[PDB]
Amino acid sequence: DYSVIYNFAPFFAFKCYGVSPTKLNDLCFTNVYADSFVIRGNEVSQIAP
Amino acid sequence: KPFERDISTEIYQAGNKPCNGVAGPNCYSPLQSYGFRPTYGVGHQPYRV
């Protein structure tokens, strides 16, 4: 449920590449992997395809 | 629906809170811009239909 994800703090960058933001809940996947790390402000852009 | 035209830009309210006509968290302008350059590959080059 992405309702809680939206209900968390306002996001500086919330960009969806493969899965549409609208269809996030609609689409289903076998496994989900979340990678958590702390990076500087200008390093945010480097985390992208 | 088939053969329809929409030109009005309302800030997309994907979130649970009204956007109030401004951009921000969970508030994105629906319109997005193609960028066309001579060096782009076939498949991203502008095609007139």
Contact between B10 and B23 under an 8 Å Cβ cutoff? The reply is no
Which stretches of B1-49 are assigned E, i.e. beta strand? 12-13, 27-28
Residue with tokens 């609609």: A26
Which chain A residues touch B25 with a CB distance below 8 Å? 10-11, 14
Experimental method: cryo-EM
- With CA atoms as reference, the chain B residue closest to A11 would be B25
Resolution attained, angstroms: 2.9
Name the nearest CA neighbour of B16 among A5, A49, A46: A5
Contact between A48 and A15 under an 8 Å Cβ cutoff? The reply is yes
CA-to-CA distance for B27 and A13, rounded, in angstroms? Answer: 12
Question: Taking CA A27 as the corner, what is the angle to CA A32 and CA B31, rounded to the nearest 5 degrees?
Answer: 110
Contact between B22 and B11 under an 8 Å Cβ cutoff? The reply is yes
Token pair of B29 as six digits: 């302008």
SS3 state of residue B24: strand
Which chain A residues touch B24 with a CB distance below 8 Å? 10
Q: Checking DSSP bridges between strand B27-28 and strand B12-13, what pairing results, if any?
A: antiparallel
